[PDB]
Design a protein around this ligand. Structure first.
Ligand SMILES: CC1(C)S[C@@H]2C(NC(=O)[C@H](N)c3ccccc3)C(=O)N2[C@H]1C(=O)O
Ligand SMILES: CC1(C)S[C@@H]2C(NC(=O)[C@H](N)c3ccccc3)C(=O)N2[C@H]1C(=O)O
Lengths: 617, 617, 218
């Protein structure tokens, strides 16, 4: 029979060898790199055509290396095939490497969520540190087009693997750039913020741990997660209905609600500081990092306190989580001066890496910190940062006290007073307007810059503000909440927001008129007031002292603006509700545990609530 | 060691026992259904919880059955889990079945693009007809929750499987509804339109035939496919560079550019009419179906001509390809009276199926055709349709003649004349505004309703129009292009557009003022003027007679509007360029073959070019 | 299904709601015009209009009621059907035998925004469709009390004038009482995801308490 007319076989070719591969400006190599224990990791190596003695940029990920190196699947150019954040390195003729971490996608082995370093939580012979070590060693001995020099980078979990590598790096690892890294999931990164549980973790658990490869989110009943979580009750109740009780990582998390040995043995900022790395580091996070706000700044500061003898620079731009690898010209309704993300990548990131990865390159002398000013709209270069803080700094912090008539003053109010608000767990304050589902990435990403006017309009939120500013107030450093608060219950969460109120009218951009822009906010779970590792019941109606750091600022409250402070006791559904009655484990709270409570914030006198502001000249 | 602290194993559970399955209102059964030759087909059966004596709605697809039955992956309700087009059947308590056709995704066997029916092109013991027969037989003997009655539906390729089943159906198949079915890929469906090749097929080939499962599109050099295809030259040159020469189906298509035995043996409209089927049929296609305009109407008409002894109704709504399964409220800038798609599904589709699938249900008496009026904005029920055509109809067609001064008249112009335009293959007319890539689904879907003013402004397009209408002109049926055209070359394509010019000003919706809306347009490859199977060279400068049907219409050209006709010789990059020089195979046209030509359209006299309009009272 | 003066524009939508075609043009063309032609253009066809022509915001069609309404408090074919507030913040057609009460604190320093902040009366685009806005923001507040039926197994048809029969107490000596009748959309609306659980008010109003006994004498 004529094959050009009659097909009795298959129309699917046995093997494909398309000439589009010869039309590429790069070469893609797939290799199973063996670790010291025999476990092989899937590694993608993207080499520019005619590359000779080129440096290597490495990233280790739980997010499918094959896909990460395929922004535009099988693209004709390296620029399209690699992520937007790799732009400056593609332009620099770097060799790009993406590797699936142990137990994920193309890699063999067992997967352990944020696998702990060797120690009491990991008694085996391998960890993310040795895996990175073995990887770098293989690369410098099996990539002839390379110069044997490796640089490491990555954001979030991809930043976590960089930090792990820094614990004991291979001699060929010449430079590192952890971006929004997961450093302490309990203190202020992905899982908790000062012990307050982040409910978006459930979808992440099922999505990343259902299979070696891809997984799905938890099927929902309602389009609104405010509804879904409130109806389920406690976080543990939602997890149980989702089937998470059979997931080993959730089993461990549920067993360790407090900051005990399980979480302390995973605090990478403290562990890295003990090791005192000698590899040049560039730490980065967004000023509005909605997923890993604790990581970079705390790791960088710990290293500074440990007196590291290696380049250790902190970079913070006007970005959301991982925004550094995309376009940084805007965030929500905010507009910045140009693509700040590309600016950093091109003017700082790239030259810094070139110095150690490309022999003969110009030397860069980076300061302590490079931070974008969200007030002046420009990049600030700080030789020594911060210049103001609570201890061991040139100057101290400047308290902005809460006052009578819901005001704020830099003068300590002698008059004693208190403002009350009722916190009702049956009607928790939406962290962003309803309806909201964790699946709505477009709403989640810029949530930290949203207008706080909705919250202000509620009786379960207390708001304070200065008079309209006649002179600008410059802040640069870490604000500290010095809170004196009472609750009629035996437990409570305390949400503190530092806000920049835009001019009453903004005629050049009308929508921004009176807009309440939060520059720094966080939540503190009251039971941990005395000890993060040992939760304790609060005394009903007792004015108690809470003292905790808030996200860093580098802002200028300009003329016409106001400084504002908002305090509330819920932030739903991002954070699970504090039942306001002391229970052993808030994950297991029952319907009858949730108690309406009256909260009282004291102002003036010996218990003068204030925000310790890093005011500078 | 403590397992709740120390994990030396994997965080990925061996298997998941999700309790969310008990909250579902449906169950899913996955079965490998064996065909008569031993080959097993992956079949997904979606049964409403506690269903009994329920009818079955079956669809056979090359687009992943598992995914088709997972609109919202693992949803809690059957309504979410199934496609939007299944809404009325979910409400009716139907059992939904999606099956992977032989050789695709979860199914075994060899895959053959639009596998031809048993005959000269398929000498084996199986085909899509027997596969459907074996499937229905298994379903009625292995699904206890069913009443033994099966209904078949599906759009495009999923409609093609319905037609194939109708060739020799199982006695349990009580009713069928082919939607925009692939019936004749050469005459006017997916691959060609009157011999003019559709270049979007290349991406489809690589996406559907690279592997049993999912594939990818062809990597592009430029963002604009106008640029990509023009730079490549001929369609065969693009296919070669894409690596399609190793794909068996392309090898067969390339060897059969003309309507020979290979395509004639695949014309389902002619084959089905010869089989004398007795299964009630409901044929559907969009009035603006940009992918399968030929299929439904031609199959329905052939059966009507063969005096089919079964219900045979044609339905055409104001939809784009497969629009019947979504929301039919709008299309491009057009707005219709409500969700026309849901209206049809609820008022016609569902009750028709219920009559034969749910014993005891009310009987429906559908007319010849149910067509939406794109002028009156209402559903028309035509007992006998069409009422006007070339032969064997109640009335004849009404010619709208091209006239002097670029006008259009219902009066046969006595004066002989001609208008000329230069067709340059180096500057082909964009079918839609540049830039355009076949990957841009949002621009491709509603392309048939786009404003034709851009084309009008070009010197390589001739435009004719009536005076502003003082009285409405109603049309219902199939328009026929009666073209008398000459070319200075030895080959040429002829694009003819029937347009409704909106009122000069539309104050209630300003953007529509003077908008040139095409209600019916198509292309004809000149070499097939005398015979579709035997291409012939055209005589240079000879006025030749072209006679071909255009897409059906059911419209009213209202007062203030104009009727317009546009003629051109290219439609890029949707259709490959006619070199305008007769070559044996246009697929393999060489750079030197492409020739600039002068086109002349004659009007009036014995060669009075016109559009034979189906004008009705 | 229109906002104020919506009859003179396009009636295909209102906020996020979508109706069956341009309902405003439908009325203007099929009812308004022929009715006027009968008395203004001698020789025109006579039209026999019913008591009321009302669009059904549930069935998405025009209803022609010869006699409307068919149910009301006095002098109608039938009476009204009470939908009682119940324990557990529920709603029931069955009169609850036991006495109960739910409380909420009304603070004038933090009044409930009728629509999301910020809002200026100059923003006509936000003002026009305000009556169809989602009431989920209000529900989330402690100064708002919310009641709901279980998910409906059977449709409930309503046509006429609803009446608020309120038994309320305040610790003050005056108070406003806002009552909203809402249709909660299905938990999930896969064909239009944004509508899932949407709390659409079909009828709401406010009553100034001082006028409880007499509108003329507070
Ligand atoms: C590094 C990223 C590009 S991938 C990661 C991500 N996406 C997901 O987590 C998503 N569920 C996913 C995608 C692919 C495989 C597995 C899971 C996202 O966002 N993060 C980015 C970031 O931090 O910049
Ligand atoms: C029936 C459909 C829902 S799937 C089909 C489609 N999409 C593709 O062809 C696409 N390449 C694809 C998607 C998923 C798996 C494999 C291939 C599209 O559009 N058609 C729809 C229609 O006709 O209604």
């Amino acid at each position: 029979h004529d094959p050009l007319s009659v097909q009795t076989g298959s129309d699917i070719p046995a093997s494909v060898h398309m000439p589009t591969d010869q039309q590429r400006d790069y070469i893609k190599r797939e290799v199973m790199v063996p670790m010291r224990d025999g476990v092989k990791l899937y590694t993608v190596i993207v080499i520019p055509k005619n590359a000779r003695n080129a440096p290597i940029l490495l990233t280790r990920t739980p997010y499918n290396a094959k896909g990460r190196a395929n922004r535009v699947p099988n693209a004709l150019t390296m620029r399209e095939v690699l992520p937007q954040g790799d732009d400056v390195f593609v332009e620099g003729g770097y060799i790009r490497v993406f590797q699936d971490i142990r137990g994920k996608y193309g890699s063999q082995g067992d997967y352990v969520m944020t696998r702990p370093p060797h120690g009491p939580l990991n008694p085996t012979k391998t960890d993310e540190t040795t895996d990175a070590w073995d990887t770098v060693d293989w690369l410098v001995h099996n990539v002839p087009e390379s110069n044997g020099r490796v640089g490491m980078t990555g954001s979030a979990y991809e930043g976590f693997t960089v930090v792990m590598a820094l614990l004991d790096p291979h001699p060929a690892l010449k430079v590192a750039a952890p971006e929004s890294p997961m450093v302490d999931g309990w203190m202020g990164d992905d899982w908790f913020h000062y012990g307050a549980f982040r409910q978006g973790a459930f979808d992440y658990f099922v999505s990343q741990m259902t299979a070696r490869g891809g997984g799905n989110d938890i099927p929902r009943r309602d389009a609104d997660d405010y509804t879904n979580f409130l109806k389920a009750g406690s976080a543990g109740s939602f997890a149980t209905q989702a089937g998470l009780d059979q997931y080993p990582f959730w089993q461990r998390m549920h067993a360790h609600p407090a900051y005990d040995a399980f979480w302390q043995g995973q605090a990478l900022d403290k562990i890295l500081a003990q090791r005192k790395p000698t590899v040049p580091m560039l730490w980065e996070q967004g000023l509005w990092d909605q997923e890993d706000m604790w990581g970079a700044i705390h790791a960088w500061q710990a290293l500074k306190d440990a007196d590291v003898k290696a380049p250790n620079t902190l970079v913070m731009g006007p970005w959301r989580h991982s925004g550094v690898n995309y376009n940084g010209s805007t965030l929500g309704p905010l507009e910045f001066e140009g693509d700040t993300a590309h600016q950093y990548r091109r003017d700082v990131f790239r030259p810094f890496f070139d110095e150690y990865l490309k022999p003969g390159s110009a030397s860069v002398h980076l300061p302590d910190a490079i931070i974008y000013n969200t007030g002046d709209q420009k990049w600030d270069y700080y030789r020594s940062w911060p210049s103001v803080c609570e201890s061991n700094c040139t100057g101290g912090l400047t308290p902005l006290y809460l006052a009578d008539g819901h005001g704020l003053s830099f003068t300590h109010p002698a008059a004693d007073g208190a403002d009350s608000y009722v916190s009702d767990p049956a009607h928790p304050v939406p962290f962003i307007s309803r309806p909201f589902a964790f699946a709505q990435s477009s709403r989640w990403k810029p949530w930290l810059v949203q207008d706080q006017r909705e919250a202000e309009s509620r009786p379960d939120v207390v708001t304070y503000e200065t008079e309209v500013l006649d002179e600008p107030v410059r802040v640069s450093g870490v604000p500290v909440a010095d809170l004196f608060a009472a609750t009629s219950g035996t437990d409570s969460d305390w949400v503190v927001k530092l806000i920049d109120v835009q001019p009453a009218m903004t005629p050049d951009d009308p929508k921004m008129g009176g807009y309440e822009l939060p520059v720094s906010m966080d939540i503190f779970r009251g039971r941990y007031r005395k000890d993060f590792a040992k939760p304790e019941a609060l005394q009903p109606d007792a004015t108690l002292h809470y003292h905790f750091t808030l996200p860093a600022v580098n802002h200028v409250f300009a003329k016409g603006h106001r400084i504002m402070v908002q305090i509330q006791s819920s932030w739903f559904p991002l954070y699970d509700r504090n039942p306001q009655k002391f229970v052993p484990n808030i994950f297991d709270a029952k319907p009858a545990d949730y108690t309406v409570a009256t909260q009282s914030i004291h102002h003036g006198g010996k218990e003068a609530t204030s925000i310790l502001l890093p005011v500078v000249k």
